[PDB]
DNA sequence: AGGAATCCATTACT
DNA sequence: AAACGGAGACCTGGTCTCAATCTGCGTGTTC
DNA sequence: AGATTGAGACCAGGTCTCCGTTTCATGAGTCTTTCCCGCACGAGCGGGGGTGATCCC
DNA sequence: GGGATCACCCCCGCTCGTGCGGGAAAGACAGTAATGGATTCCT
């Protein structure tokens, strides 16, 4: 139960007899349409109609997505045209029975520390609140950013302390890797557990396991070394790509989800970040021709 | 193939119906002229190009001179011209025609010559019948669209009914018939609704602009003469 | 009532002053109106021969579902339907 | 360089109200001679086309053909190059808004017209004629309204005016 | 009993006090309105409101003309705001028997020589078509001018004999210079006699008083000079032109018409032309001056 | 408001999901965004697609698109579908144009309860044949009596119009046929597929949960898309292929008179209103000035962007 | 529906490409299409904010008897109210 | 007697 | 005198090709 | 690789004065009757939206 | 009572119908012109 995320950039991409082949910028990849489950459509690149109708046949999911997945434009079918995680994930958001078990099993993920499942969630935003404030807290002391407290506003941009807008614009980078996902393997954005009523509810919730772990330290990080007028927005995006260049957090989400959707191990369908180049040796076994 | 009619002027089937054009423009320091075929009006800081077509009579105030192809242009669109004057207004004019039939003439001409026709229509006349700047510029905006439409089309001027022994006798027959019903109101209104250092001409044609477009008053210039002509 | 509008360019100074008595001109060789659809072929008509050499197109209310219908004639901004509907084709040099 | 002239003639002006009546075309190319013309049956004809051309029911029942036929051959045979003619532009788009009655398909073609070139070489007065164009390049002959003789005619004025 | 016709060519108007100031290149005149009873105006000519203004209220007549009245353009109030005329010209269509007189005076006045009494309108709409046929016949091999048919095309004029545009651009002509006389006069065109059913009724009704005067004879004149390429047309109407200056034809319509009128010659009021730089020896005793 | 962008507008600005036209046809073309204009490469020339007023813009055989240009269509909330033969081969669509989600929240809460699923299928049937009581059976039948309505309906068409039918029920899942009966109704069928595909993508609606369908991630569109091809398109399919001719592209052909049906159909108003019923929404000016919120079993939903540890 | 007339002159292309998406070009630089109220005033707000240094002009369907109301920014043909009937100034030499 | 000029009869055209 | 029309006059806003630089437009534990 | 910004060169076409040239483009010896075409008008109506009752909790 | 369910208008956009005021198109209205047959003259 292995799913290809493999990502593709710089690329016009067609068929030839019954394989997808890739004309990138620097050769031609030839990777056959059975091995593509999820594929990752970066800038710039260019689809063939012959290309989506035998990948049409194969179930594969495609999505459209920024440089390494840092921004979701739009999405495709989901992997395999399977529907089951969506279907257990509509039955766990009705009920509360499971809406809180759920619930509790993010939060608990939040709290590697402490148990605090058996308290009511109305101190764990308050418990919650502590944490991300410490956290927020200790990053500016370790990188020496001052830090009051976080003022934004979605309707000015630019203004205010970088900080902000740099922690603002890295956490923006992280939903477009979360939401290629989800799209990809079938998961509605809409039914979100702990936030509820806009379109990314479940976007913001499942991000929510990678705010305290990449997203934020990334930010302050990034914001130190810059200075004055530098545009932190696409700074912030481009180191954000970096950490997204191993792929590790795609392998480490994709397991999270239907873990969080108490999918049996059965079920646990595994996605391997598959990259054209990047596993020059790893995709030749299965009879792929390069050219160049 | 090509199978084309001579152009370079309007044919009165070309022009809108004596409904669809707008009811009058106003006009102040400017010297007409018709360059490229188009009417134009020039004012100091630039000049304008009216929509001929689209509108009913075109009223010319005090120090505006007008060449004579102007006239000629604006009488293909059969728009007709008036001269606003200080104290009332001062002299007419008029193209020749909107409408080729002259049934509305001709049984004009019947109601008139018969004295018991003119007591008829005098009759009917009566029947929907029931500070002098601003005043003075809502007659002449209604003497100056009255016209118009009257030379539209094709009626008489100069046979009135109850206004008569002048040139333009009918129009003062059949512009008084609405005066005391639109004009009157909208003229209280401007005078106590005033204020020093607004333009008066601008302010009071622009609210008498609007009753006559409100009221459907132009709708009502053809329908009314044509029930008072039987037609 | 419904709205058409005109555009003009290239074209003899006479018709392009011409319109005027009928259309307002917003800017060079452009004019908007609101004629009945009768009103509408004769101002084309005239513009289908006092024209000249040159290129216009006209764009008016219509019964297809976007609201419009083109009308070119002589023009690199070429006029195809797409299942009934109207857009604009530029062919390449 | 590949151009066809397609002369065409309604009993009308109207979309909806009028009807094609006569269609014939030949492609002005190479020189080769594929001369083509076609005709549609009819039963009512306007009174003012019957006295400039005379048209009846009866020509066009023993000559004419289906509308749909004689149209999908033009679009098969109009698919290569472009559509030429004097004052074509008028007529190309009733023809291709018929096209839209009968689903003939995507008429791909440059909407250029002949008789806007023609104008230019005197841009005079606002109205110009067929007879006034042709004596102007010494083409005497007059019109037979008749789809290969004004094919043959718009053939001479394009040799002739050549402004493409 | 005096009228003035006063036809300006070529030059702007204004006043000075009380006069109109023609603005020719050749001179300055200021000749009072006082006498001014009508006021043609030519081509290329200019006119201000507040010169307009003492015309209205003097009542004098403005009608603007093509070349001294060759075409009509557009009128104003006719004489002195007086209807003394049109109402007499409206009780006259009216009344058949008024209107089997007054058609029988338009054919007596065309041919006093025959019988006219017991004709009506069928038998004069007869009668002068035979007399023009024979007016057309005689007159064509006069010129030797080959006259195969009177037919004109209201929609393509150009196609036909050059005879055709003469005739019509001759026809035509006329028709200008009466209907301003008789909208300065103060009739309306629309009460026709013989004539009926149109705008212009009663100037096709007047008009035929001078047909086979002026228009035919000058017509074939123009035609049997008429040479190959030319606008035979433009032709006619310079010839018709010339012919108009003199007034002695202006001086028949304003009397014929009242006398058509049946207007007792107590209250016919005779009218001539009054020639800015040909009467100027007469204008002075009457107050007029002019400056160069 | 903010700043304006190049390629980038809100929901605001862009007209309601009822005030749009129904799709476009690309054929042998490139799809390309030059000068932040989304256009069609083809043989001759270009075209610039006006894609606010797009319900769909679907794709045949032998057509590109550059991942920039899906950026553009999906700013506007246009679905992208690739019909090419056998009917379509793959779905496409972007973000949700409506910022609320109300209708996605009832649409899975109304799914698990199967006396809520039972009473909408019910609800469902009815709009097909008002004619019809169906307030007992359950589902297993209804696909036999919705096919048979289904089957008995594309014979009697089929006899009328003289088109003899190969007994074969449209199937767009690897649909199969050359025959010109083939082509003109599955080329019309998708035609409607495209803009049920855009208003479920337009209103926030899952297109993998549907009711009678199910099994694959594009259930829901064929549980509503039938709503209508039995009473739209497969008339007017038919009426094509009878009246087809020899040597001449029927698909233009029928793709053309469906519109003509879709505007006098008045679809957009129906169609809309349709799901409403389906999932039984009240109607409600709701302004929803706040449209994410946390949610709080104890407390209805807390707002969202407050630190709640002081 | 009132109708919506857009013209541009002198505007950065990113604009005169962009707005494609919701009208059709007659004529280059020559917008046209058929909006709301509210859908026309914010694609002004679109027009605003990125023209720049530009010229930009709409006409749109209004309770005047013409028919229609002038809207112009930046543009060298102003426009000036007549009584409440909207007619091109032309500023002259 | 026959044609031909004339006249009348007549349709026909302006 | 006005106005058109042509032949000049030179105007410039648009189209196009050419590197160069870019992968993109950013609130959800902000009060 | 597909796309945007900019600098670069281009230039057809809008605009200008000057110059020449027109004073305009062309029917109605007869109207009357019966036609045809129209978009005009009202008014019929659907159609839901809003409003108003019952129906269900 | 409130929400939920089943029905109330209004009325206004929408559709359609006649229909009216315009076409154009013929068909009337008189004496001559022109053609041909009867009459008369001529071979």
Request: aromatic letters at 8%; proline letters at 3%; one cysteine or more.
């Amino acid at each position: 139960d292995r799913a290809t995320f493999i990502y593709i950039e710089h690329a016009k991409i067609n068929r030839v007899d019954s394989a997808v082949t890739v004309a990138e910028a620097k050769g031609v990849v030839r990777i056959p349409a059975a091995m593509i489950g999820v594929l990752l459509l970066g800038p710039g690149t260019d689809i063939s109609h012959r290309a989506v109708e035998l990948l049409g046949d194969t179930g594969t999911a495609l999505v459209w997505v920024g440089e390494q997945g840092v921004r979701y434009y739009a999405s495709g079918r989901a992997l395999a045209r399977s529907t089951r995680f969506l279907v257990k994930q509509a039955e766990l958001v009705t009920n509360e029975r499971s809406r809180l078990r759920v619930a509790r099993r993010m939060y608990q993920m939040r709290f590697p520390t402490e148990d605090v499942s058996k308290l009511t969630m109305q101190q764990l935003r308050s418990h919650e609140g502590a944490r991300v404030r410490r956290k927020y807290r200790e990053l500016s002391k370790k990188y020496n950013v001052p830090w009051k407290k976080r003022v934004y506003n979605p309707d000015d941009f630019a203004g205010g302390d970088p900080i902000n807008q740099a922690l603002s614009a890295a956490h923006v980078a992280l939903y477009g890797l979360v939401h290629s996902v989800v799209a990809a393997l079938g998961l509605s954005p809409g039914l979100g557990f702990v936030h509820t009523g806009h379109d990314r509810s479940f976007i913001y919730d499942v991000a929510d396991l990678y705010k305290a772990e990449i997203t934020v330290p990334i930010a302050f990080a990034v914001a130190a070394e810059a200075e004055e007028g530098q545009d932190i927005g696409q700074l912030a995006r481009l180191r954000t790509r970096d950490a997204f260049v191993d792929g590790k957090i795609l392998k480490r989400m994709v397991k999270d989800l239907q873990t969080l959707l108490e999918i049996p191990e059965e079920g646990q369908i595994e996605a391997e970040p598959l990259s054209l180049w990047d596993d020059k040796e790893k995709l030749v076994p299965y009879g792929v021709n390069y050219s160049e | 193939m090509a199978g084309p009619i001579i152009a370079g002027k309007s044919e009165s089937s070309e022009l809108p119906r004596v409904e669809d054009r707008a009811t009058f423009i106003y006009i102040e320091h400017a010297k007409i002229n018709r360059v490229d075929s188009a009417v134009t009006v020039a004012e100091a800081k630039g000049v304008v190009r009216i929509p001929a077509a689209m509108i009913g009579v075109l009223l010319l105030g005090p120090g505006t001179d007008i060449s004579h192809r102007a006239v000629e242009l604006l009488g293909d669109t059969g728009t007709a011209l008036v001269w606003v004057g200080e104290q009332g207004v001062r002299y007419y004019a008029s193209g020749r025609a909107l409408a080729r039939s002259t049934r509305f003439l001709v049984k004009q001409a019947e109601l008139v010559t018969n004295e018991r026709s003119r007591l008829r229509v005098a009759r009917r006349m009566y029947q929907m019948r029931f500070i002098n700047q601003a005043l003075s510029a809502a007659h002449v905006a209604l003497y100056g669209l009255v016209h118009s439409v009257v030379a539209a089309l094709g009626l008489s001027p100069g046979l009135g009914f109850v206004h008569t022994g002048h040139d333009r006798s009918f129009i003062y027959d059949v512009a008084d018939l609405y005066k005391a019903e639109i004009t009157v109101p909208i003229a209280f209104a401007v005078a106590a609704e005033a204020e020093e250092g607004q333009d008066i001409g601008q302010l009071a044609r622009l609210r008498t602009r609007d009753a006559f477009v409100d009221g459907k008053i132009l709708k009502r210039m053809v329908k009314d003469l044509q029930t008072l002509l039987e037609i | 009532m419904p709205m058409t509008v005109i555009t003009l360019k290239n074209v003899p100074q006479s018709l392009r002053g011409d319109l005027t008595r009928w259309m307002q001109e917003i800017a060079t060789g452009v004019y908007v109106g609101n004629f009945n659809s009768r009103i509408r072929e004769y101002l084309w008509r005239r513009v289908q021969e006092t024209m000249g050499a040159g290129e216009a197109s006209m764009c008016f209310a219509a019964r297809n579902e976007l609201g419009y219908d083109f009308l070119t004639e002589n023009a690199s901004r070429s006029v195809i339907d797409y299942d009934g509907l109207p857009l604009i084709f530029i062919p390449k040099e | 360089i590949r151009y066809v002239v397609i002369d065409i003639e309604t009993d009308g002006k109207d979309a909806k109200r009028n009807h094609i009546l006569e269609i014939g075309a030949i492609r002005c190319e190479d020189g080769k001679e594929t001369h083509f013309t076609a005709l549609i049956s009819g039963d009512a004809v306007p009174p003012s086309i019957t006295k400039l051309t005379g048209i009846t029911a009866t020509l066009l029942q023993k000559e004419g053909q289906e509308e749909k036929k004689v149209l999908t051959a033009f679009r098969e045979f109009i698919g290569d190059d472009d559509l030429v003619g004097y004052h074509v532009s008028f007529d190309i788009e009733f023809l291709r808004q018929a096209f839209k009655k009968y689903g003939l398909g995507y008429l791909k073609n440059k909407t250029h017209d002949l008789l806007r070139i023609v104008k230019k070489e005197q841009l005079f007065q606002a109205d110009y004629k067929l007879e006034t164009s042709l004596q102007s390049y010494g083409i005497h002959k007059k019109v037979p309204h008749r789809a290969l003789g004004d094919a043959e005619l718009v053939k001479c004025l394009a040799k002739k005016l050549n402004k493409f």
